Design a protein around this ligand. Structure first.
Ligand SMILES: [K+]
Ligand SMILES: [K+]
Ligand SMILES: [K+]
Ligand SMILES: [K+]
Lengths: 271, 279, 279, 279
């Protein structure tokens, strides 16, 4: 979240249509729908009394005729009369379907958006693994389907002072022992070894709070479920780092002797 | 007792309604999907019918206060067949009409997308050698297996990952399952079109360096292959995965050749040899 | 006399009907596209009308041998409004009907795809500083320019390329145009949301090292910027390009700052200062 | 007797019904595809007609027990033209109606997707120099060829692979076909818009180092080019492949230039020169 005030209507039409809330989107469409039919109705009246069984010079009748015509229900009470009437008809028809074509695309465009079934460990931990302190957290796939060429970024964000004494926010991508997982299917524990190259080297808790430093995780991959790309983002604050902690294991052997995953343990950190 | 199946799906027991609507709709079996749609379809028409009755006797040639008539009218209206026997009467009737119409088409728009979303799935025409082999190639033992494209169409910027999965111990004594991506001599094939023999030279950097068969079984180690690429057939990305167990490694073996020279002098492919390993 | 325009499109004269149908349909202006469709629409109905007349007087309530009547019938039939005055008569009439219908819908299917294909294009809300500047930052002269995101939505794993294009002479004396990608202090921004000032430190490795203004004009050298990233707004990838000429480099200049404190004490972005370069 | 054709498709003889439905539907020729759809269309209506007859005389104004009438009614119903002569009668008739309707639209949804799936395929407007040349550039012999963009639209992050394919003998004495990707002086072009001359310097690392013509024929060696990039025209990825045989290498040749200055003083591109190699 980046709240702020941007100083600077139809400009971004396509974005806006995909960005709007479903209620609003439907409204807009509806509005457009009603509107255009009214317009068409007027076109009809404009010709004057060109529709069978229509109360003379009545907009309602014309309007409803226009819908029956444009939605192509074509009930059959109200009917065109004469060249002008019908031309407007064959024009509306086309208009109607084009509208459908445009509506569909929008619908589909906004409708077809997957979500990685990915869950983030509520905490990070800093603990010794393979002889160097390692910052870690872990992802669990929440669905049976697999994610291919999945990969993750662990980014430290913190404030720094320039020689000139500008106090700004700067981003550090943190080298992970494993950044790609071509086949992510159950759980993945991501690790950033801390050594003389880690921007968090020889850093205590006190020092982390002091730079007002947070940790941002971006996960992305190709989800087999949707046959489409997915991603998920999470953020941690200095205080969600459990120093010395170790993620419990979620891997079990059943009585049956069959391996298992207990995602109840997923958020549990031994200490 | 393998952790990973041949199809590449992990082999574990997992221990755990409208929440995942979109996934579920794409995940359901066609029978069910069609049912759901149908249900929704019938349902909404019934609802609309009630709306009509609610106004009371607002449809031409409808038996007074009869749901059937109203229902069927509602379908003729929403599917926009608009036969013409049953007709709206008065403002209330018609407003409901012009509302249904819109509803009908929107439904179509939503149904279509779903249909298309679930319908437009490709499958790499890719076949995996049933076995791997460890044998000397160019002066270093090399683990290899091979892929054959099963279709005439080509796969572009195809690439493959060979991942060893096995049990280990940390200095801290954590006993975990670790993944080792194994350096392949060749990982890209910009035009994968017939057969590709993937190789992982084994040297002091290979996590399987100086490892016998006994040692592989001992770490309960398997090998996972992920292939992916852009299929010209579908003009869309495809992939395929496969897994091998320690015992599907044929030591000393050599893949037979399926590549021939015809009498004509034109090269050829005999995909019967594909799974054949000389020994 | 610039090779590249500001919009990033190369500025050259190219020297070279139904050949490129699909491209052309997506490339045409909406007015024209709609016209084409319309034309096709009217055309085919006329054709069908003739088919009807050809049979001769096969439509209920149609003025004998009148094209208009047949034409309008054909539309009512193909758009499937099917009013009900004009009706088919006999096998020939109806076969043509059930053929048109199918035709109508297929047309829709084709029109839709085109519409959707041309309709579903995002545009990075990205604005480029009208100028570049060369100035000392952190103790080395640095070429820089800056991007501002014009929308509230964020761009993920955004990244940018700064490419110098200029003329050179080979030892063999070929005088060609070469591209140099210029090392940026920061080329990736996983989360681009407001403004980004891109920098190319100039040192013994920069192809523009120890280069004055005179020398830049002399190689007729320009600077091309390509930005790309995944836009949350569209949940789809976006990009933007821009180009600068030697003379849009403000030597010694410094981009002003665009971050403000409101009277309200709320922080702000004045994309008013965005193009302002102190000197 | 080339292994690979110019189109990039391997040139080999392969030695080996409803199984591959989706592929087949996208792979079929338009004529056939349309036929299939038509067939399906007619077929299902016939089926439905029978359903109607099966009930017996349930359609207004239908000649008793006549399939034609029922069939045509079925189309008017399923395409939802719903003219109004033929009308359902009784619950059975109408249920079949509201079922057909749904069926009709679903069909449309399926047809559309297919249409769109097969319809929305781009083609890089890319042209390959008919020949390669080996000549001295910047003090080392360089293998080169060149691409020209055939459209006004630009290709972004375009890139190309130059792959040598030739026969070899392993130390173990396996006589196989090996692919060598050849290091190019420039493999990426973030903005490809007019012409691009690709180069593979030949030095002690080039698999074609110190190789004459005789030696190339001898390994029956060819050169495969894969180009790919994101086409602004289609807002979608495109690619193109090409292949060259040993004998399409013009030794000592130099590509002519296609860049001109008009009388007007405006730069230009003459595609007559594109295939011309000075010697
Ligand atoms: K109708
Ligand atoms: K009617
Ligand atoms: K798409
Ligand atoms: K209709």
């Amino acid at each position: 979240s980046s709240n702020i005030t941007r100083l600077g209507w139809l400009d971004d039409h396509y974005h806006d249509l995909l960005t709007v809330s479903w209620p609003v989107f439907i409204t807009l469409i509806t509005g457009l729908y009603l509107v255009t039919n009214a317009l068409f109705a007027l076109a009809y009246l404009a010709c004057g009394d060109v529709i069978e069984n229509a109360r003379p010079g009545s907009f309602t009748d014309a309007f409803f005729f226009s819908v029956q015509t444009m939605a192509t229900i074509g009930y059959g009470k109200l009917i065109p009369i004469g060249p002008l009437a019908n031309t407007l008809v064959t024009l509306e028809a086309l208009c109607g379907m084009l509208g459908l074509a445009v509506a569909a695309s929008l619908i589909y465009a906004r409708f077809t958006r997957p979500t990685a079934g990915v869950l983030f460990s509520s905490r990070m931990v800093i603990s010794d693994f393979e002889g160097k302190p390692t910052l870690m957290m872990r992802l669990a796939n929440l669905r049976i389907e697999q994610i291919i060429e999945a990969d993750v970024h662990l980014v430290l964000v913190r404030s720094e002072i320039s020689q000139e004494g500008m106090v700004f926010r700067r981003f550090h991508d943190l080298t992970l022992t494993r950044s790609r997982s071509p086949i992510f299917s159950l759980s993945w524990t991501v690790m950033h070894p801390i050594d003389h190259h880690s921007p968090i080297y020889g850093e205590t808790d006190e020092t982390l709070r002091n730079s007002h430093s947070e940790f941002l995780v971006l996960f992305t991959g190709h989800h087999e479920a949707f046959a489409q790309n997915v991603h998920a983002r999470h953020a941690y604050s200095c205080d969600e780092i459990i120093w010395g902690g170790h993620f419990v294991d979620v891997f079990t052997t059943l009585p049956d002797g069959r391996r298992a995953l207990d995602l109840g343990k997923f958020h549990e950190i031994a200490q």
